[PDB]
mmCIF file of C-alpha atoms and ligand atoms in Angstrom:
data_model
loop_
_atom_site.group_PDB
_atom_site.id
_atom_site.type_symbol
_atom_site.label_atom_id
_atom_site.label_comp_id
_atom_site.label_asym_id
_atom_site.label_seq_id
_atom_site.Cartn_x
_atom_site.Cartn_y
_atom_site.Cartn_z
ATOM 1 C CA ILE A 247 0.003 -0.067 0.014
ATOM 2 C CA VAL A 248 1.248 3.320 -1.426
ATOM 3 C CA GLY A 249 2.191 4.656 -3.721
ATOM 4 C CA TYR A 250 3.766 2.602 -6.594
ATOM 5 C CA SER A 251 4.677 -0.901 -7.654
ATOM 6 C CA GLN A 252 8.089 -2.571 -7.496
ATOM 7 C CA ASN A 253 7.394 -3.267 -11.253
ATOM 8 C CA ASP A 254 7.436 0.444 -11.865
ATOM 9 C CA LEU A 255 11.184 0.633 -10.964
ATOM 10 C CA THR A 256 12.486 -1.883 -13.371
ATOM 11 C CA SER A 257 12.774 0.436 -16.338
ATOM 12 C CA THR A 258 13.069 4.217 -17.186
ATOM 13 C CA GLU A 259 9.991 3.977 -19.427
ATOM 14 C CA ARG A 260 7.970 2.521 -16.582
ATOM 15 C CA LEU A 261 9.200 5.269 -14.160
ATOM 16 C CA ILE A 262 8.121 7.887 -16.671
ATOM 17 C CA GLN A 263 4.591 6.373 -16.960
ATOM 18 C CA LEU A 264 4.436 6.193 -13.250
ATOM 19 C CA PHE A 265 5.318 9.880 -12.991
ATOM 20 C CA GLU A 266 2.826 10.593 -15.658
ATOM 21 C CA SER A 267 -0.135 8.977 -13.725
ATOM 22 C CA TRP A 268 1.153 10.747 -10.590
ATOM 23 C CA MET A 269 0.812 14.081 -12.315
ATOM 24 C CA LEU A 270 -2.703 13.205 -13.287
ATOM 25 C CA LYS A 271 -3.587 11.907 -9.789
ATOM 26 C CA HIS A 272 -2.551 15.350 -8.370
ATOM 27 C CA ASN A 273 -3.636 17.691 -11.256
ATOM 28 C CA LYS A 274 -0.056 18.748 -11.690
ATOM 29 C CA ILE A 275 0.493 21.177 -14.555
ATOM 30 C CA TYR A 276 3.946 22.590 -15.488
ATOM 31 C CA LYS A 277 4.905 25.547 -17.641
ATOM 32 C CA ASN A 278 6.903 23.726 -20.254
ATOM 33 C CA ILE A 279 8.504 20.302 -20.787
ATOM 34 C CA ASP A 280 11.718 21.742 -19.416
ATOM 35 C CA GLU A 281 10.052 21.930 -16.023
ATOM 36 C CA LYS A 282 8.308 18.610 -16.713
ATOM 37 C CA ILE A 283 11.619 16.925 -17.294
ATOM 38 C CA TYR A 284 13.172 18.701 -14.255
ATOM 39 C CA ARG A 285 10.240 17.535 -12.183
ATOM 40 C CA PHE A 286 10.742 13.967 -13.424
ATOM 41 C CA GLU A 287 14.352 13.984 -12.124
ATOM 42 C CA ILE A 288 13.198 15.267 -8.776
ATOM 43 C CA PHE A 289 10.368 12.759 -8.721
ATOM 44 C CA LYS A 290 12.917 10.028 -9.637
ATOM 45 C CA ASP A 291 15.178 11.031 -6.720
ATOM 46 C CA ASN A 292 12.409 11.160 -4.142
ATOM 47 C CA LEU A 293 11.159 7.773 -5.341
ATOM 48 C CA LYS A 294 14.564 6.296 -4.694
ATOM 49 C CA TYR A 295 14.701 7.849 -1.230
ATOM 50 C CA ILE A 296 11.091 6.649 -0.384
ATOM 51 C CA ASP A 297 11.739 3.123 -1.571
ATOM 52 C CA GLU A 298 15.025 2.944 0.395
ATOM 53 C CA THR A 299 13.639 4.506 3.471
ATOM 54 C CA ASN A 300 10.481 2.260 3.492
ATOM 55 C CA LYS A 301 12.711 -0.841 3.847
ATOM 56 C CA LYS A 302 13.739 -0.026 7.388
ATOM 57 C CA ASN A 303 10.799 -1.061 9.686
ATOM 58 C CA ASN A 304 9.644 2.176 11.327
ATOM 59 C CA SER A 305 6.138 2.936 12.565
ATOM 60 C CA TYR A 306 5.385 5.158 9.667
ATOM 61 C CA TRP A 307 6.038 5.186 5.947
ATOM 62 C CA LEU A 308 6.834 7.652 3.083
ATOM 63 C CA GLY A 309 5.050 7.897 -0.210
ATOM 64 C CA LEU A 310 4.632 9.589 -3.622
ATOM 65 C CA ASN A 311 2.346 12.287 -2.088
ATOM 66 C CA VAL A 312 1.667 15.831 -3.428
ATOM 67 C CA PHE A 313 5.258 17.022 -2.722
ATOM 68 C CA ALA A 314 6.963 14.213 -4.491
ATOM 69 C CA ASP A 315 8.071 16.415 -7.432
ATOM 70 C CA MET A 316 9.775 18.812 -5.051
ATOM 71 C CA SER A 317 13.319 18.849 -3.722
ATOM 72 C CA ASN A 318 13.565 19.249 0.033
ATOM 73 C CA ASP A 319 15.184 22.654 -0.511
ATOM 74 C CA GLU A 320 12.367 23.854 -2.720
ATOM 75 C CA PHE A 321 9.920 22.403 -0.109
ATOM 76 C CA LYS A 322 11.695 23.885 2.911
ATOM 77 C CA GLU A 323 11.430 27.369 1.472
ATOM 78 C CA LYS A 324 7.824 27.262 0.248
ATOM 79 C CA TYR A 325 5.764 25.302 2.811
ATOM 80 C CA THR A 326 7.978 25.838 5.843
ATOM 81 C CA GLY A 327 8.735 29.242 7.520
ATOM 82 C CA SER A 328 5.227 30.029 8.761
ATOM 83 C CA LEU A 329 6.619 30.991 12.122
ATOM 84 C CA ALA A 330 8.069 34.370 12.665
ATOM 85 C CA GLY A 331 9.065 32.803 15.988
ATOM 86 C CA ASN A 332 9.974 34.156 19.417
ATOM 87 C CA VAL A 333 -7.103 14.795 35.678
ATOM 88 C CA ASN A 334 -8.449 11.763 33.842
ATOM 89 C CA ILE A 335 -8.871 12.373 30.135
ATOM 90 C CA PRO A 336 -10.320 10.035 27.528
ATOM 91 C CA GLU A 337 -7.848 7.327 26.185
ATOM 92 C CA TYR A 338 -8.724 8.671 22.711
ATOM 93 C CA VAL A 339 -9.760 12.009 21.407
ATOM 94 C CA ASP A 340 -10.662 13.068 17.856
ATOM 95 C CA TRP A 341 -12.663 16.200 17.443
ATOM 96 C CA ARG A 342 -13.278 15.232 13.823
ATOM 97 C CA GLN A 343 -15.776 12.678 15.202
ATOM 98 C CA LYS A 344 -17.663 15.505 17.106
ATOM 99 C CA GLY A 345 -18.243 17.533 13.947
ATOM 100 C CA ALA A 346 -15.867 20.267 15.175
ATOM 101 C CA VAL A 347 -13.341 20.210 12.224
ATOM 102 C CA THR A 348 -13.974 21.696 8.756
ATOM 103 C CA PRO A 349 -12.485 20.081 5.708
ATOM 104 C CA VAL A 350 -8.687 20.088 5.196
ATOM 105 C CA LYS A 351 -7.317 23.328 3.720
ATOM 106 C CA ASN A 352 -4.285 24.032 1.651
ATOM 107 C CA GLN A 353 -2.072 27.052 2.441
ATOM 108 C CA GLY A 354 -0.423 26.829 -0.991
ATOM 109 C CA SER A 355 3.007 28.364 -1.506
ATOM 110 C CA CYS A 356 2.560 30.921 1.234
ATOM 111 C CA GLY A 357 4.087 31.016 4.711
ATOM 112 C CA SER A 358 0.569 31.405 6.222
ATOM 113 C CA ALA A 359 0.190 28.229 8.348
ATOM 114 C CA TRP A 360 0.177 30.517 11.459
ATOM 115 C CA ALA A 361 -3.230 31.793 10.258
ATOM 116 C CA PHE A 362 -4.484 28.418 9.212
ATOM 117 C CA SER A 363 -3.698 26.968 12.601
ATOM 118 C CA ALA A 364 -5.339 29.780 14.492
ATOM 119 C CA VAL A 365 -8.540 29.783 12.268
ATOM 120 C CA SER A 366 -8.894 26.047 12.645
ATOM 121 C CA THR A 367 -9.000 26.188 16.476
ATOM 122 C CA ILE A 368 -11.435 29.145 16.247
ATOM 123 C CA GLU A 369 -13.834 27.262 13.997
ATOM 124 C CA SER A 370 -13.624 24.306 16.393
ATOM 125 C CA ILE A 371 -14.216 26.158 19.733
ATOM 126 C CA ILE A 372 -17.277 27.824 18.203
ATOM 127 C CA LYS A 373 -18.737 24.462 17.173
ATOM 128 C CA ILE A 374 -18.004 23.184 20.664
ATOM 129 C CA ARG A 375 -19.663 26.294 22.276
ATOM 130 C CA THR A 376 -22.447 27.317 20.030
ATOM 131 C CA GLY A 377 -23.219 24.094 18.135
ATOM 132 C CA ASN A 378 -22.308 25.234 14.590
ATOM 133 C CA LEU A 379 -19.354 24.473 12.381
ATOM 134 C CA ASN A 380 -18.381 27.389 10.118
ATOM 135 C CA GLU A 381 -15.431 28.266 7.909
ATOM 136 C CA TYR A 382 -13.604 31.400 8.848
ATOM 137 C CA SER A 383 -11.081 33.670 6.938
ATOM 138 C CA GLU A 384 -7.320 32.949 7.063
ATOM 139 C CA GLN A 385 -6.917 35.694 4.442
ATOM 140 C CA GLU A 386 -8.232 38.186 6.949
ATOM 141 C CA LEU A 387 -5.611 37.316 9.528
ATOM 142 C CA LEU A 388 -3.026 37.249 6.859
ATOM 143 C CA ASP A 389 -3.983 40.663 5.704
ATOM 144 C CA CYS A 390 -4.770 42.262 9.012
ATOM 145 C CA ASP A 391 -2.546 40.895 11.815
ATOM 146 C CA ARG A 392 -0.067 43.723 12.102
ATOM 147 C CA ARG A 393 2.260 41.679 14.323
ATOM 148 C CA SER A 394 2.671 38.929 11.656
ATOM 149 C CA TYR A 395 4.465 39.112 8.333
ATOM 150 C CA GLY A 396 1.858 37.775 5.861
ATOM 151 C CA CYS A 397 3.324 35.179 3.633
ATOM 152 C CA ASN A 398 6.667 35.367 5.362
ATOM 153 C CA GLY A 399 5.344 33.834 8.551
ATOM 154 C CA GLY A 400 3.579 35.075 11.652
ATOM 155 C CA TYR A 401 2.480 34.115 15.249
ATOM 156 C CA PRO A 402 -0.521 31.892 15.984
ATOM 157 C CA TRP A 403 -1.099 33.611 19.364
ATOM 158 C CA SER A 404 -1.165 37.012 17.649
ATOM 159 C CA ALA A 405 -3.911 35.690 15.261
ATOM 160 C CA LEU A 406 -5.966 34.288 18.145
ATOM 161 C CA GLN A 407 -5.801 37.578 20.019
ATOM 162 C CA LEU A 408 -6.914 39.579 17.008
ATOM 163 C CA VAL A 409 -10.034 37.313 16.810
ATOM 164 C CA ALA A 410 -10.566 37.730 20.565
ATOM 165 C CA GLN A 411 -10.308 41.526 20.423
ATOM 166 C CA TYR A 412 -12.005 42.225 17.164
ATOM 167 C CA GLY A 413 -13.578 39.263 15.438
ATOM 168 C CA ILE A 414 -13.267 37.279 12.197
ATOM 169 C CA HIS A 415 -15.303 37.049 8.939
ATOM 170 C CA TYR A 416 -16.526 33.919 7.121
ATOM 171 C CA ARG A 417 -14.235 32.279 4.593
ATOM 172 C CA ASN A 418 -16.860 32.878 1.951
ATOM 173 C CA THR A 419 -16.958 36.596 2.901
ATOM 174 C CA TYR A 420 -13.128 36.944 2.876
ATOM 175 C CA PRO A 421 -11.783 34.073 0.651
ATOM 176 C CA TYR A 422 -8.164 32.884 0.654
ATOM 177 C CA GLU A 423 -5.806 34.188 -2.009
ATOM 178 C CA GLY A 424 -2.434 32.939 -0.804
ATOM 179 C CA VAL A 425 -1.075 36.463 -1.145
ATOM 180 C CA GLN A 426 -1.050 39.332 1.415
ATOM 181 C CA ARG A 427 -3.202 42.318 0.423
ATOM 182 C CA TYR A 428 -4.343 45.296 2.277
ATOM 183 C CA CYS A 429 -6.621 44.777 5.280
ATOM 184 C CA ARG A 430 -10.271 44.573 4.013
ATOM 185 C CA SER A 431 -11.965 43.872 7.403
ATOM 186 C CA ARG A 432 -14.078 46.984 7.362
ATOM 187 C CA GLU A 433 -15.262 46.515 3.844
ATOM 188 C CA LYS A 434 -16.983 43.238 4.832
ATOM 189 C CA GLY A 435 -19.331 44.594 7.416
ATOM 190 C CA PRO A 436 -19.815 43.032 10.929
ATOM 191 C CA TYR A 437 -17.686 40.197 12.056
ATOM 192 C CA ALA A 438 -19.090 36.698 11.928
ATOM 193 C CA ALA A 439 -17.580 35.694 15.191
ATOM 194 C CA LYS A 440 -15.538 36.934 18.085
ATOM 195 C CA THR A 441 -13.726 34.965 20.762
ATOM 196 C CA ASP A 442 -13.294 35.971 24.339
ATOM 197 C CA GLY A 443 -9.617 35.233 24.800
ATOM 198 C CA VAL A 444 -6.444 33.188 24.288
ATOM 199 C CA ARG A 445 -4.725 30.823 26.713
ATOM 200 C CA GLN A 446 -1.268 29.237 26.426
ATOM 201 C CA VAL A 447 -0.668 25.682 27.337
ATOM 202 C CA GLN A 448 2.276 25.227 29.845
ATOM 203 C CA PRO A 449 5.039 24.498 27.349
ATOM 204 C CA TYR A 450 7.439 21.553 27.347
ATOM 205 C CA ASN A 451 4.710 19.411 29.035
ATOM 206 C CA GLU A 452 3.005 16.560 27.296
ATOM 207 C CA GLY A 453 0.362 16.056 29.918
ATOM 208 C CA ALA A 454 -0.691 19.650 29.911
ATOM 209 C CA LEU A 455 -1.056 19.619 26.120
ATOM 210 C CA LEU A 456 -3.174 16.349 26.169
ATOM 211 C CA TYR A 457 -5.517 17.862 28.876
ATOM 212 C CA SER A 458 -5.966 20.866 26.602
ATOM 213 C CA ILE A 459 -6.611 18.805 23.462
ATOM 214 C CA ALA A 460 -9.396 16.980 25.455
ATOM 215 C CA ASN A 461 -11.240 20.375 25.770
ATOM 216 C CA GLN A 462 -10.433 22.046 22.464
ATOM 217 C CA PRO A 463 -8.242 21.655 19.397
ATOM 218 C CA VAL A 464 -4.993 23.376 20.261
ATOM 219 C CA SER A 465 -2.736 25.388 17.956
ATOM 220 C CA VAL A 466 0.835 23.976 18.077
ATOM 221 C CA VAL A 467 4.105 24.325 16.322
ATOM 222 C CA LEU A 468 6.639 21.783 15.022
ATOM 223 C CA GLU A 469 9.627 21.450 12.731
ATOM 224 C CA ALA A 470 8.258 20.317 9.374
ATOM 225 C CA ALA A 471 11.120 21.076 6.928
ATOM 226 C CA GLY A 472 12.591 17.583 7.001
ATOM 227 C CA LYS A 473 12.487 15.321 3.922
ATOM 228 C CA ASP A 474 10.740 12.595 6.015
ATOM 229 C CA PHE A 475 8.069 15.066 7.010
ATOM 230 C CA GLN A 476 7.771 16.271 3.392
ATOM 231 C CA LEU A 477 7.291 12.715 1.908
ATOM 232 C CA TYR A 478 5.273 11.474 5.001
ATOM 233 C CA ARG A 479 2.401 9.227 3.937
ATOM 234 C CA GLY A 480 1.000 7.270 6.894
ATOM 235 C CA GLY A 481 1.596 5.765 10.241
ATOM 236 C CA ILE A 482 2.852 7.144 13.577
ATOM 237 C CA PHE A 483 5.660 9.647 12.895
ATOM 238 C CA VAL A 484 8.507 9.007 15.104
ATOM 239 C CA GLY A 485 11.192 11.334 13.605
ATOM 240 C CA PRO A 486 13.784 12.263 12.721
ATOM 241 C CA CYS A 487 13.187 16.025 13.154
ATOM 242 C CA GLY A 488 14.774 18.643 15.286
ATOM 243 C CA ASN A 489 13.355 21.272 17.679
ATOM 244 C CA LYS A 490 13.793 24.277 15.342
ATOM 245 C CA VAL A 491 10.108 24.713 14.883
ATOM 246 C CA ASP A 492 9.080 26.260 11.559
ATOM 247 C CA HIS A 493 5.444 25.414 11.059
ATOM 248 C CA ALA A 494 2.079 25.908 12.762
ATOM 249 C CA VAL A 495 -0.629 23.251 12.893
ATOM 250 C CA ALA A 496 -3.695 22.169 14.856
ATOM 251 C CA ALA A 497 -3.763 19.337 17.405
ATOM 252 C CA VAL A 498 -7.226 17.902 17.091
ATOM 253 C CA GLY A 499 -6.841 14.599 19.017
ATOM 254 C CA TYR A 500 -4.633 11.994 20.474
ATOM 255 C CA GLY A 501 -4.403 8.286 21.306
ATOM 256 C CA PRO A 502 -2.085 6.193 23.582
ATOM 257 C CA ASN A 503 0.949 6.606 21.269
ATOM 258 C CA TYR A 504 0.281 9.786 19.430
ATOM 259 C CA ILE A 505 -1.064 13.216 19.034
ATOM 260 C CA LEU A 506 -3.352 13.760 16.117
ATOM 261 C CA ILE A 507 -2.275 16.717 13.874
ATOM 262 C CA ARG A 508 -4.298 18.567 11.265
ATOM 263 C CA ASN A 509 -1.928 20.061 8.660
ATOM 264 C CA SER A 510 -2.705 22.570 5.942
ATOM 265 C CA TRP A 511 -1.107 21.126 2.829
ATOM 266 C CA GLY A 512 -4.252 19.698 1.327
ATOM 267 C CA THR A 513 -5.544 16.195 1.454
ATOM 268 C CA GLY A 514 -2.781 14.883 -0.795
ATOM 269 C CA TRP A 515 -0.368 14.873 2.085
ATOM 270 C CA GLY A 516 -0.056 12.391 4.910
ATOM 271 C CA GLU A 517 -3.225 10.600 6.205
ATOM 272 C CA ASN A 518 -5.622 12.703 4.075
ATOM 273 C CA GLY A 519 -3.993 15.912 5.372
ATOM 274 C CA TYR A 520 -3.260 14.591 8.875
ATOM 275 C CA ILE A 521 -0.308 13.215 10.695
ATOM 276 C CA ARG A 522 -0.063 11.162 13.846
ATOM 277 C CA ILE A 523 2.980 12.165 15.857
ATOM 278 C CA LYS A 524 4.667 9.921 18.400
ATOM 279 C CA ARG A 525 4.124 10.928 21.965
ATOM 280 C CA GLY A 526 5.154 9.617 25.421
ATOM 281 C CA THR A 527 8.894 9.525 24.765
ATOM 282 C CA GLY A 528 9.288 11.679 27.824
ATOM 283 C CA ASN A 529 11.323 14.170 25.801
ATOM 284 C CA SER A 530 10.023 17.517 27.062
ATOM 285 C CA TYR A 531 10.319 19.244 23.555
ATOM 286 C CA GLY A 532 8.109 16.680 21.984
ATOM 287 C CA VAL A 533 8.851 14.961 18.724
ATOM 288 C CA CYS A 534 9.618 17.749 16.124
ATOM 289 C CA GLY A 535 9.373 20.181 19.048
ATOM 290 C CA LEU A 536 5.672 19.771 19.196
ATOM 291 C CA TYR A 537 5.416 21.056 22.795
ATOM 292 C CA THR A 538 7.299 24.326 22.196
ATOM 293 C CA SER A 539 4.431 26.759 21.933
ATOM 294 C CA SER A 540 0.818 25.972 22.156
ATOM 295 C CA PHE A 541 -2.252 28.231 22.159
ATOM 296 C CA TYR A 542 -6.043 27.987 22.034
ATOM 297 C CA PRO A 543 -9.028 30.263 21.753
ATOM 298 C CA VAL A 544 -11.425 30.928 24.587
ATOM 299 C CA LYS A 545 -15.150 31.258 24.006
ATOM 300 C CA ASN A 546 -17.772 31.921 26.738
HETATM 301 CL CL1 CL B 709 13.298 23.095 27.802
HETATM 302 CL CL1 CL B 710 6.601 16.176 29.124
HETATM 303 NA NA1 NA B 711 -10.406 26.469 6.884
#
């Protein structure tokens, strides 16, 4: 299972056809054949890495996901860098099962995950409090959070606080463009929602984070720039990654061995946009520095 046959490797011509059907499977369109050929070479290299890395018996595996035609350097730059930086709980939690999570979004080639992370926890807390699941505007936070840097990264806590002090509009009222424009908040009329505050989970503390997740999805950060993270396909991700967090995501559950993480790279990444990250190793940073900096919205 995922995402090619051993028969595909026995021949250049086969590799090409494999690459062809992977482009179709992801609606990949390139400028010219020069890029297409370039992309094949990248594809070919990540295939080789995947195939070699999947021999090794870890608890997760890599795959020809949406980022398979990208070099890790290319990937580092474009989908990593969203951070401007600096009591008996259920055995299992998954807020997807309570209707509190909207469908998976795609930040595109924009360092905006700080807004995506925040907005996701906001949508969730309002469902939990008021009973309705809505989609809210990442573009608004992108454009309007003066402490953040738009597509060059920002702070989740800053985005949450904006929503607590002012409000946020609906996705459909302020749609995502993946580019920072001027603030258009006042042009859209009244806010759709307003939170009442922001709290921070005690950092470097797994138990504290789990407790929080059991009440609300939490906005957390991790280091996502690694090639194993990039090509991640399924299973419990156990490393390797450092503690130089560079990406913002939403913790929307956990089990005995893992914390459930909603990413914002579309459904063509990971377990349909999600990753399960190893927990309980005692390590106070968390795998990929997951426990570094966690915030969640408050809604009376
Ligand atoms: Cl520490
Ligand atoms: Cl801990
Ligand atoms: Na969304």
